[PDB]
Amino acid sequence: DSVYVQNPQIPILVDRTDNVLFRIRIPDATKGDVLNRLTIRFGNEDKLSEVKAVRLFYAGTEAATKGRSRFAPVTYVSSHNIRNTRSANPSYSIRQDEVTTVANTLTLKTRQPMVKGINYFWVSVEMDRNTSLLSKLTSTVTEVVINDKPAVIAGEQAAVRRMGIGVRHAGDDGSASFRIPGLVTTNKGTLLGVYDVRYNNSVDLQEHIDVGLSRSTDKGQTWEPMRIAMSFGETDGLPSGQNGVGDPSILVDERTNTVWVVAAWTHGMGNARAWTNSMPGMTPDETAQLMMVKSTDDGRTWSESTNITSQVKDPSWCFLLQGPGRGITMRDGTLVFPIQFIDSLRVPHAGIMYSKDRGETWHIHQPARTNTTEAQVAEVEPGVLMLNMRDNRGGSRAVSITRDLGKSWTEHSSNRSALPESICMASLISVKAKDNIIGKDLLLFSNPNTTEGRHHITIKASLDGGVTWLPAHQVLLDEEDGWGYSCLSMIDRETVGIFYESSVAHMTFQAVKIKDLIR
Amino acid sequence: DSVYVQNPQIPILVDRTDNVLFRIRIPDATKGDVLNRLTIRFGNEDKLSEVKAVRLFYAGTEAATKGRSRFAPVTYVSSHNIRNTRSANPSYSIRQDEVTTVANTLTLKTRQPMVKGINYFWVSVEMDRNTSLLSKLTSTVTEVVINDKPAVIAGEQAAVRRMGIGVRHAGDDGSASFRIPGLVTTNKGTLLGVYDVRYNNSVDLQEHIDVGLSRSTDKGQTWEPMRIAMSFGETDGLPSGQNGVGDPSILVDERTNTVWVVAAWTHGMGNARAWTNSMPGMTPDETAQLMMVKSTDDGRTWSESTNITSQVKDPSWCFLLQGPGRGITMRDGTLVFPIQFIDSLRVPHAGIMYSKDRGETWHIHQPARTNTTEAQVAEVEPGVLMLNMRDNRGGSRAVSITRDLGKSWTEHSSNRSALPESICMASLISVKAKDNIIGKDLLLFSNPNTTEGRHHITIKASLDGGVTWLPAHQVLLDEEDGWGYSCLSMIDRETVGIFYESSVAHMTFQAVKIKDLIR
């Protein structure tokens, strides 16, 4: 008569058939014990008209050698299975009961005889496809009846659950995977999300990879079918698998609403990683190419790619590429893309590339810091760029300032201190006081909030130019394991968008009120 | 200047669209060099009317990091891609030429400008779907023309190439993989091949695994649609993923033509490996079950399963299961299945299980040897059983003799010396002098002929009861990488069949004349 309940802080996908609402471990069953009924309650303010169905599953037992503290024997709803990312694998989970009209109190039944020791059950919640991305469920398991006796319920199960949408799932449109997210909002309120389309598998360049783009005109409720923003197909009669282009970075030229996508085209290099195989030189046969496309029609259609390699790459560098995610327009109209290069001694450096002429010509000055890679840049105060950097030393983000577009750099107080990481892409954006309901300048940051692995995807806010990230000003979105990359963009004056690699979909979009971050 | 040719000793699958006939490395190309034409020659007695087409593909270049000795940058034809195991991945290979009129001399052309340094090309051969499994091609590249000058050809390319058939490919009938082959020939000359059907992935038990069966009445040219010989679905209301049955062993009762399949049913155990998670006891909730089905109609239909566990399992053992592959009928009508058990101290032992009453009751006496697992058994002389064992000590097969059905054991002269292995399943069968065209007693053995990895699948023959395996009495079938398991069965008086996990298909069948083994 002891039962343990988990309410996992992972997104409820409005496009999924199953989502894990509760996991339940019954640790000390007698053979023959029956969970006759469990009762769930939803908060008085939950919009239950958007809940399509709640289901109760049995997932069997645990291996003798795997211990007594887990909430499942296996992943219930796969984010990698190209044949099914949307419903519970029916070979791991057996439906016990279903309710299709959802009240504030709800009862699910089984007649399953339990095995001796550990028995796993879980509750699935299915949403209406049209569920608001801003809806939340506050759900508790209030009663569990075993052999017609109420059992003692234990577990942290007070999570307020959030919605999201699986913009891209493993296997969509025939692609094995999608990685490396970037997100902007056009001057028309339009969300543009870029990613690698990794056709064959999930391995990095070199491979068959294109840059894909998902466009939303309704703040993420619906996404237009995937557009290919950049591709090199069988250029020069080399295979498409030796012509990948990826790790995209997107920005909106806020003066013109022209949208810019920069990415790294790898030509040749066998079936091996660009990171170690890109070599010094300038030609596509020698080194990775820095390539840009543009949209003048709010992201519907994309130009032929232009090759900017010769403008900004030092021939001695092994590899120059964009920092994946996004770039910015500054207050004075400067377009800025974060960049990263491997020098002649194979040491990586973050810095910035900028255009003062609407993206006609590009320029790189000095690296910000040794042994850094992926970085995002924000204009934290007028003329002041903050570069927030993946650091190979581990444990924490590197943070530097330039007032001269990277001719010179200064260490920020927050450097190697304020923002924990496991060596992983992170998103940083700035929001002007006039451009948000708080009416204060903000920095917003997202990454996996851990020093090991890629989990606990969290949005953090700073009110003081990134000197302090108070724990009160943070929202946990995904406590389970994913590939970790994320990109932020403000949707409107009240809500931030996050396009990320989650535990629930390769490209996950969620929308968070600023007033949930800063109370 | 210099061109390197490989003729890989791997099976040509009569059911594939593409098969690698030649791999070509041009190491020191100038940018813009063109392979104008390549000429291949087939032996005067080759049945070229069975060749449907030959193609020339370009696969581009090699990674800077990966050296100068490889024959491809990537696998050309996938044995694992559930969306395409039958043709070359179009993203790794671009067709240059195709000839559908195949003559003793054949010329393939390209117009492809090469990159500086390493350039890969390869020759695909497609066979008539009705091609004889006994056909052989003797092909060499005799001329390679670059910039209208013949190049110097180097490489070992004198392989005599063999046909085979992909009975099971990754993804067939919605299964992610197939593993653990067994093969017998019924008294009617019918081939019965058994395997795990691993639905979700290629992980061992515990998982969603059934025993499948492929049946051929024409010596392997055609296989009937897959039958499920054994399955436990949602037994006891546990998920099918916690009800896997696998590692099958098949035998023919030579007195009755009744066919017997034994396999290990794991019930519960979470999503973890049975090898470490099966525990002492006797019930399905406690330990892996030894389960049998039978066919009285030459393998068309299979009985409901019977639980044999209580007849043979010591309760103290952590795990009792069959040795995968096949069992035998002895001259005196005894049915024998190899077995393996993990004792109370987690130490594995091989031995034998036998029935004197046509499969009604079964018996185990003593293990043959400490720290052995998968084994196969042959009646090398009347009343004399040879057990040939996977040995965890590494490097070589263990070989023991019992004249009392495993009450007592003796080391064979060949023990831990004559047959190299990497710790892998191997097949051993006996062939009577009166039953084969050589008119001499044979032992036939198959495994990966290596002490490291799983490659060089080789049939070996012995004319002295397995005392000696002479190098001249061996046929190499598969020099490239696979999961390594194999099972032998004589097809007729003249040919041995081998059903195995190969570099070209999950379940591969080939036929080999005995007179190729013993010249």
PDB file of C-alpha atoms in Angstrom, chain A residues 10-235:
ATOM      1  CA  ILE A  10       8.397  17.963 -19.893  1.00  0.00           C
ATOM      2  CA  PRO A  11       6.319  19.609 -22.610  1.00  0.00           C
ATOM      3  CA  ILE A  12       2.768  18.385 -23.372  1.00  0.00           C
ATOM      4  CA  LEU A  13       2.766  18.377 -27.213  1.00  0.00           C
ATOM      5  CA  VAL A  14      -0.604  19.565 -28.683  1.00  0.00           C
ATOM      6  CA  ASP A  15       0.255  17.494 -31.866  1.00  0.00           C
ATOM      7  CA  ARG A  16       1.008  14.229 -29.938  1.00  0.00           C
ATOM      8  CA  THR A  17      -1.414  11.326 -29.357  1.00  0.00           C
ATOM      9  CA  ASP A  18       0.266  10.482 -25.997  1.00  0.00           C
ATOM     10  CA  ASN A  19       2.157  12.709 -23.515  1.00  0.00           C
ATOM     11  CA  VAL A  20       3.403  11.473 -20.083  1.00  0.00           C
ATOM     12  CA  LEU A  21       1.287  13.260 -17.430  1.00  0.00           C
ATOM     13  CA  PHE A  22       2.156  10.925 -14.512  1.00  0.00           C
ATOM     14  CA  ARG A  23       4.559   8.014 -14.000  1.00  0.00           C
ATOM     15  CA  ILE A  24       3.681   5.693 -11.119  1.00  0.00           C
ATOM     16  CA  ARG A  25       5.932   3.146  -9.410  1.00  0.00           C
ATOM     17  CA  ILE A  26       4.324   0.578  -7.111  1.00  0.00           C
ATOM     18  CA  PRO A  27       7.535  -0.828  -5.566  1.00  0.00           C
ATOM     19  CA  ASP A  28       6.430  -3.721  -3.229  1.00  0.00           C
ATOM     20  CA  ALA A  29       3.445  -5.466  -4.921  1.00  0.00           C
ATOM     21  CA  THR A  30       2.334  -8.989  -3.923  1.00  0.00           C
ATOM     22  CA  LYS A  31       1.681 -11.139  -7.058  1.00  0.00           C
ATOM     23  CA  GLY A  32      -2.078 -10.676  -7.821  1.00  0.00           C
ATOM     24  CA  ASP A  33      -2.465  -7.115  -6.373  1.00  0.00           C
ATOM     25  CA  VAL A  34      -4.818  -4.981  -8.549  1.00  0.00           C
ATOM     26  CA  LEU A  35      -4.829  -1.200  -8.975  1.00  0.00           C
ATOM     27  CA  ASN A  36      -8.703  -1.051  -8.964  1.00  0.00           C
ATOM     28  CA  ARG A  37      -8.851   2.735  -9.573  1.00  0.00           C
ATOM     29  CA  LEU A  38      -6.834   5.922  -9.441  1.00  0.00           C
ATOM     30  CA  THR A  39      -8.299   9.434  -9.253  1.00  0.00           C
ATOM     31  CA  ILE A  40      -6.726  12.532 -10.846  1.00  0.00           C
ATOM     32  CA  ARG A  41      -7.755  16.187 -10.183  1.00  0.00           C
ATOM     33  CA  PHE A  42      -7.122  19.248 -12.421  1.00  0.00           C
ATOM     34  CA  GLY A  43      -6.941  22.784 -10.940  1.00  0.00           C
ATOM     35  CA  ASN A  44     -10.151  24.917 -10.836  1.00  0.00           C
ATOM     36  CA  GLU A  45      -8.720  27.166 -13.637  1.00  0.00           C
ATOM     37  CA  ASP A  46      -7.546  24.401 -16.036  1.00  0.00           C
ATOM     38  CA  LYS A  47      -9.320  24.681 -19.451  1.00  0.00           C
ATOM     39  CA  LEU A  48     -10.486  21.035 -19.573  1.00  0.00           C
ATOM     40  CA  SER A  49     -12.351  21.640 -22.935  1.00  0.00           C
ATOM     41  CA  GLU A  50      -8.839  21.438 -24.579  1.00  0.00           C
ATOM     42  CA  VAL A  51      -8.153  17.947 -23.030  1.00  0.00           C
ATOM     43  CA  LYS A  52      -9.149  15.330 -25.730  1.00  0.00           C
ATOM     44  CA  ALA A  53      -8.350  12.171 -23.667  1.00  0.00           C
ATOM     45  CA  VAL A  54      -6.635  10.794 -20.544  1.00  0.00           C
ATOM     46  CA  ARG A  55      -5.436   7.134 -20.616  1.00  0.00           C
ATOM     47  CA  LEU A  56      -3.980   4.729 -17.991  1.00  0.00           C
ATOM     48  CA  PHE A  57      -1.226   2.376 -19.149  1.00  0.00           C
ATOM     49  CA  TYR A  58       0.486  -0.659 -17.550  1.00  0.00           C
ATOM     50  CA  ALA A  59       4.228  -0.948 -18.468  1.00  0.00           C
ATOM     51  CA  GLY A  60       5.016  -4.188 -16.507  1.00  0.00           C
ATOM     52  CA  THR A  61       8.011  -4.509 -14.100  1.00  0.00           C
ATOM     53  CA  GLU A  62      11.706  -3.596 -13.621  1.00  0.00           C
ATOM     54  CA  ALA A  63      14.907  -5.592 -14.137  1.00  0.00           C
ATOM     55  CA  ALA A  64      16.284  -7.086 -10.876  1.00  0.00           C
ATOM     56  CA  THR A  65      19.628  -5.271 -11.367  1.00  0.00           C
ATOM     57  CA  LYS A  66      18.267  -1.742 -12.133  1.00  0.00           C
ATOM     58  CA  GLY A  67      17.124  -0.750  -8.612  1.00  0.00           C
ATOM     59  CA  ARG A  68      13.987   0.576  -6.951  1.00  0.00           C
ATOM     60  CA  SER A  69      14.047   4.393  -7.650  1.00  0.00           C
ATOM     61  CA  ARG A  70      13.118   4.606 -11.399  1.00  0.00           C
ATOM     62  CA  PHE A  71       9.718   5.768 -12.734  1.00  0.00           C
ATOM     63  CA  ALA A  72       9.733   3.611 -15.929  1.00  0.00           C
ATOM     64  CA  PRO A  73      11.599   0.605 -17.391  1.00  0.00           C
ATOM     65  CA  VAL A  74      11.929   2.317 -20.831  1.00  0.00           C
ATOM     66  CA  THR A  75      11.017   5.533 -22.717  1.00  0.00           C
ATOM     67  CA  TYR A  76       7.204   5.360 -23.241  1.00  0.00           C
ATOM     68  CA  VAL A  77       6.839   7.904 -26.109  1.00  0.00           C
ATOM     69  CA  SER A  78       9.895   7.996 -28.479  1.00  0.00           C
ATOM     70  CA  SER A  79      11.317  11.237 -29.955  1.00  0.00           C
ATOM     71  CA  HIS A  80      13.676   9.153 -32.254  1.00  0.00           C
ATOM     72  CA  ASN A  81      11.465   6.297 -33.623  1.00  0.00           C
ATOM     73  CA  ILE A  82      10.949   7.370 -37.327  1.00  0.00           C
ATOM     74  CA  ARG A  83       7.892   4.973 -37.454  1.00  0.00           C
ATOM     75  CA  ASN A  84       6.145   6.573 -34.397  1.00  0.00           C
ATOM     76  CA  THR A  85       7.036   9.690 -32.369  1.00  0.00           C
ATOM     77  CA  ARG A  86       3.409  10.576 -31.544  1.00  0.00           C
ATOM     78  CA  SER A  87       1.910   7.679 -29.514  1.00  0.00           C
ATOM     79  CA  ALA A  88       3.123   5.286 -26.787  1.00  0.00           C
ATOM     80  CA  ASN A  89       5.066   2.299 -28.194  1.00  0.00           C
ATOM     81  CA  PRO A  90       2.291  -0.328 -27.807  1.00  0.00           C
ATOM     82  CA  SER A  91       5.007  -3.002 -27.091  1.00  0.00           C
ATOM     83  CA  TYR A  92       6.054  -1.095 -23.859  1.00  0.00           C
ATOM     84  CA  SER A  93       2.611   0.155 -22.669  1.00  0.00           C
ATOM     85  CA  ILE A  94      -0.847  -1.561 -22.549  1.00  0.00           C
ATOM     86  CA  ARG A  95      -3.921   0.673 -22.317  1.00  0.00           C
ATOM     87  CA  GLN A  96      -5.979  -0.123 -19.143  1.00  0.00           C
ATOM     88  CA  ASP A  97      -8.632   2.661 -19.378  1.00  0.00           C
ATOM     89  CA  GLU A  98      -9.509   5.871 -21.247  1.00  0.00           C
ATOM     90  CA  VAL A  99     -11.762   8.918 -20.508  1.00  0.00           C
ATOM     91  CA  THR A 100     -12.615  11.151 -23.573  1.00  0.00           C
ATOM     92  CA  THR A 101     -14.702  13.787 -21.635  1.00  0.00           C
ATOM     93  CA  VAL A 102     -12.536  15.352 -18.906  1.00  0.00           C
ATOM     94  CA  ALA A 103     -13.911  16.673 -15.573  1.00  0.00           C
ATOM     95  CA  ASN A 104     -11.961  18.371 -12.681  1.00  0.00           C
ATOM     96  CA  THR A 105     -12.007  14.868 -11.026  1.00  0.00           C
ATOM     97  CA  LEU A 106     -11.454  11.743 -13.192  1.00  0.00           C
ATOM     98  CA  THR A 107     -11.166   7.982 -12.348  1.00  0.00           C
ATOM     99  CA  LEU A 108      -9.155   5.358 -14.353  1.00  0.00           C
ATOM    100  CA  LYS A 109      -9.537   1.577 -13.718  1.00  0.00           C
ATOM    101  CA  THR A 110      -7.542  -1.617 -14.228  1.00  0.00           C
ATOM    102  CA  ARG A 111      -8.093  -5.320 -13.611  1.00  0.00           C
ATOM    103  CA  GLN A 112      -4.346  -6.140 -14.154  1.00  0.00           C
ATOM    104  CA  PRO A 113      -2.833  -8.595 -11.627  1.00  0.00           C
ATOM    105  CA  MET A 114       0.549  -7.132 -10.586  1.00  0.00           C
ATOM    106  CA  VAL A 115       3.813  -9.198 -10.387  1.00  0.00           C
ATOM    107  CA  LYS A 116       5.758  -9.422  -7.075  1.00  0.00           C
ATOM    108  CA  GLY A 117       7.846  -6.243  -6.480  1.00  0.00           C
ATOM    109  CA  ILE A 118       8.003  -3.299  -8.912  1.00  0.00           C
ATOM    110  CA  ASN A 119       5.034  -2.457 -11.175  1.00  0.00           C
ATOM    111  CA  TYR A 120       4.900   0.579 -13.452  1.00  0.00           C
ATOM    112  CA  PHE A 121       1.777   2.444 -14.593  1.00  0.00           C
ATOM    113  CA  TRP A 122       1.478   5.807 -16.297  1.00  0.00           C
ATOM    114  CA  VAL A 123      -1.154   8.401 -17.236  1.00  0.00           C
ATOM    115  CA  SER A 124      -1.238   9.826 -20.813  1.00  0.00           C
ATOM    116  CA  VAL A 125      -2.863  13.204 -21.565  1.00  0.00           C
ATOM    117  CA  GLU A 126      -3.864  13.987 -25.192  1.00  0.00           C
ATOM    118  CA  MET A 127      -4.682  17.622 -26.056  1.00  0.00           C
ATOM    119  CA  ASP A 128      -6.944  19.110 -28.754  1.00  0.00           C
ATOM    120  CA  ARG A 129      -4.624  20.023 -31.715  1.00  0.00           C
ATOM    121  CA  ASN A 130      -5.911  23.680 -31.314  1.00  0.00           C
ATOM    122  CA  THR A 131      -5.001  23.867 -27.590  1.00  0.00           C
ATOM    123  CA  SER A 132      -3.462  27.295 -26.734  1.00  0.00           C
ATOM    124  CA  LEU A 133       0.392  27.024 -26.415  1.00  0.00           C
ATOM    125  CA  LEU A 134      -0.146  29.277 -23.288  1.00  0.00           C
ATOM    126  CA  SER A 135      -2.525  26.811 -21.490  1.00  0.00           C
ATOM    127  CA  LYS A 136      -1.232  25.024 -18.353  1.00  0.00           C
ATOM    128  CA  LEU A 137      -2.414  21.902 -16.458  1.00  0.00           C
ATOM    129  CA  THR A 138      -2.070  21.606 -12.630  1.00  0.00           C
ATOM    130  CA  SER A 139      -2.835  17.896 -12.100  1.00  0.00           C
ATOM    131  CA  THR A 140      -2.413  15.625  -9.009  1.00  0.00           C
ATOM    132  CA  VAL A 141      -3.074  11.880  -8.454  1.00  0.00           C
ATOM    133  CA  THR A 142      -5.383  12.193  -5.375  1.00  0.00           C
ATOM    134  CA  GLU A 143      -6.290   8.515  -4.734  1.00  0.00           C
ATOM    135  CA  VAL A 144      -4.838   5.108  -5.680  1.00  0.00           C
ATOM    136  CA  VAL A 145      -6.934   2.081  -4.679  1.00  0.00           C
ATOM    137  CA  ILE A 146      -5.190  -1.343  -4.465  1.00  0.00           C
ATOM    138  CA  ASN A 147      -7.187  -4.457  -3.437  1.00  0.00           C
ATOM    139  CA  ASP A 148     -10.129  -2.098  -2.555  1.00  0.00           C
ATOM    140  CA  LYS A 149      -7.945  -0.176   0.026  1.00  0.00           C
ATOM    141  CA  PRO A 150      -6.617   3.394  -0.516  1.00  0.00           C
ATOM    142  CA  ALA A 151      -2.761   3.333  -0.766  1.00  0.00           C
ATOM    143  CA  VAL A 152      -0.333   5.948   0.701  1.00  0.00           C
ATOM    144  CA  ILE A 153       0.761   8.268  -2.166  1.00  0.00           C
ATOM    145  CA  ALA A 154       4.348   9.738  -2.037  1.00  0.00           C
ATOM    146  CA  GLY A 155       6.325  11.744  -4.691  1.00  0.00           C
ATOM    147  CA  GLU A 156       6.886  15.376  -5.853  1.00  0.00           C
ATOM    148  CA  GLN A 157       3.906  15.774  -8.273  1.00  0.00           C
ATOM    149  CA  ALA A 158       3.064  19.550  -7.974  1.00  0.00           C
ATOM    150  CA  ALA A 159       4.567  20.473 -11.429  1.00  0.00           C
ATOM    151  CA  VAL A 160       2.480  23.072 -13.356  1.00  0.00           C
ATOM    152  CA  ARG A 161       2.667  21.510 -16.855  1.00  0.00           C
ATOM    153  CA  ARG A 162       3.135  23.550 -20.084  1.00  0.00           C
ATOM    154  CA  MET A 163       2.105  22.911 -23.728  1.00  0.00           C
ATOM    155  CA  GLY A 164       4.407  22.928 -26.745  1.00  0.00           C
ATOM    156  CA  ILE A 165       4.350  21.835 -30.385  1.00  0.00           C
ATOM    157  CA  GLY A 166       6.533  19.321 -32.227  1.00  0.00           C
ATOM    158  CA  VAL A 167       7.461  21.495 -35.239  1.00  0.00           C
ATOM    159  CA  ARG A 168       9.756  18.648 -36.453  1.00  0.00           C
ATOM    160  CA  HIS A 169       9.724  14.988 -35.393  1.00  0.00           C
ATOM    161  CA  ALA A 170      12.268  12.284 -36.212  1.00  0.00           C
ATOM    162  CA  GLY A 171      11.286  10.829 -39.626  1.00  0.00           C
ATOM    163  CA  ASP A 172       9.115  13.798 -40.796  1.00  0.00           C
ATOM    164  CA  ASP A 173       9.171  14.263 -44.630  1.00  0.00           C
ATOM    165  CA  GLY A 174      11.558  11.226 -44.826  1.00  0.00           C
ATOM    166  CA  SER A 175      14.394  12.890 -42.731  1.00  0.00           C
ATOM    167  CA  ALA A 176      16.038  10.657 -40.075  1.00  0.00           C
ATOM    168  CA  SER A 177      16.559  13.692 -37.777  1.00  0.00           C
ATOM    169  CA  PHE A 178      16.423  17.473 -37.287  1.00  0.00           C
ATOM    170  CA  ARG A 179      19.056  19.366 -35.227  1.00  0.00           C
ATOM    171  CA  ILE A 180      20.606  22.809 -34.515  1.00  0.00           C
ATOM    172  CA  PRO A 181      17.705  25.264 -33.997  1.00  0.00           C
ATOM    173  CA  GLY A 182      17.571  28.996 -34.725  1.00  0.00           C
ATOM    174  CA  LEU A 183      14.617  31.369 -34.302  1.00  0.00           C
ATOM    175  CA  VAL A 184      13.744  34.988 -35.168  1.00  0.00           C
ATOM    176  CA  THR A 185      10.572  37.073 -35.256  1.00  0.00           C
ATOM    177  CA  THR A 186      10.156  39.184 -38.496  1.00  0.00           C
ATOM    178  CA  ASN A 187       8.838  42.793 -38.309  1.00  0.00           C
ATOM    179  CA  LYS A 188       5.393  41.252 -39.266  1.00  0.00           C
ATOM    180  CA  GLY A 189       5.264  39.057 -36.057  1.00  0.00           C
ATOM    181  CA  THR A 190       6.175  35.940 -38.166  1.00  0.00           C
ATOM    182  CA  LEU A 191       8.249  33.211 -36.411  1.00  0.00           C
ATOM    183  CA  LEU A 192      11.029  31.689 -38.516  1.00  0.00           C
ATOM    184  CA  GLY A 193      12.739  28.514 -37.197  1.00  0.00           C
ATOM    185  CA  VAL A 194      15.854  27.105 -38.999  1.00  0.00           C
ATOM    186  CA  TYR A 195      17.437  23.655 -38.437  1.00  0.00           C
ATOM    187  CA  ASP A 196      19.628  20.994 -40.040  1.00  0.00           C
ATOM    188  CA  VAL A 197      17.636  18.397 -41.993  1.00  0.00           C
ATOM    189  CA  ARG A 198      19.834  15.325 -41.345  1.00  0.00           C
ATOM    190  CA  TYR A 199      18.422  12.877 -43.918  1.00  0.00           C
ATOM    191  CA  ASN A 200      20.512   9.699 -43.280  1.00  0.00           C
ATOM    192  CA  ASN A 201      21.117   9.694 -39.468  1.00  0.00           C
ATOM    193  CA  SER A 202      21.810  12.328 -36.711  1.00  0.00           C
ATOM    194  CA  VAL A 203      25.666  12.620 -37.211  1.00  0.00           C
ATOM    195  CA  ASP A 204      27.239  16.093 -37.712  1.00  0.00           C
ATOM    196  CA  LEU A 205      28.779  17.349 -41.024  1.00  0.00           C
ATOM    197  CA  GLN A 206      30.085  15.825 -43.197  1.00  0.00           C
ATOM    198  CA  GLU A 207      26.752  14.114 -44.230  1.00  0.00           C
ATOM    199  CA  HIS A 208      23.603  14.616 -46.349  1.00  0.00           C
ATOM    200  CA  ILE A 209      22.312  17.720 -44.551  1.00  0.00           C
ATOM    201  CA  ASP A 210      20.206  20.685 -45.772  1.00  0.00           C
ATOM    202  CA  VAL A 211      19.012  23.841 -43.944  1.00  0.00           C
ATOM    203  CA  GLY A 212      15.230  23.631 -43.329  1.00  0.00           C
ATOM    204  CA  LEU A 213      12.856  26.466 -42.289  1.00  0.00           C
ATOM    205  CA  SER A 214       9.461  26.331 -40.477  1.00  0.00           C
ATOM    206  CA  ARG A 215       7.318  29.556 -40.640  1.00  0.00           C
ATOM    207  CA  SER A 216       4.407  30.477 -38.267  1.00  0.00           C
ATOM    208  CA  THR A 217       2.052  33.518 -38.726  1.00  0.00           C
ATOM    209  CA  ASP A 218      -0.055  32.681 -35.588  1.00  0.00           C
ATOM    210  CA  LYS A 219       2.595  32.781 -32.745  1.00  0.00           C
ATOM    211  CA  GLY A 220       3.432  29.049 -33.110  1.00  0.00           C
ATOM    212  CA  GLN A 221      -0.093  27.401 -33.029  1.00  0.00           C
ATOM    213  CA  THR A 222       0.512  26.275 -36.696  1.00  0.00           C
ATOM    214  CA  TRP A 223       3.672  25.956 -38.809  1.00  0.00           C
ATOM    215  CA  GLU A 224       3.746  26.055 -42.621  1.00  0.00           C
ATOM    216  CA  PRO A 225       5.291  22.971 -44.299  1.00  0.00           C
ATOM    217  CA  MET A 226       9.104  22.811 -44.174  1.00  0.00           C
ATOM    218  CA  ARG A 227      10.967  24.931 -46.796  1.00  0.00           C
ATOM    219  CA  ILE A 228      14.593  24.147 -47.784  1.00  0.00           C
ATOM    220  CA  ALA A 229      16.399  27.495 -47.217  1.00  0.00           C
ATOM    221  CA  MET A 230      19.825  26.104 -48.380  1.00  0.00           C
ATOM    222  CA  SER A 231      21.068  22.929 -50.175  1.00  0.00           C
ATOM    223  CA  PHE A 232      24.060  21.931 -52.387  1.00  0.00           C
ATOM    224  CA  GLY A 233      22.603  18.616 -53.657  1.00  0.00           C
ATOM    225  CA  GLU A 234      25.223  17.040 -56.035  1.00  0.00           C
ATOM    226  CA  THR A 235      27.339  20.214 -56.581  1.00  0.00           C
TER     227      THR A 235
END
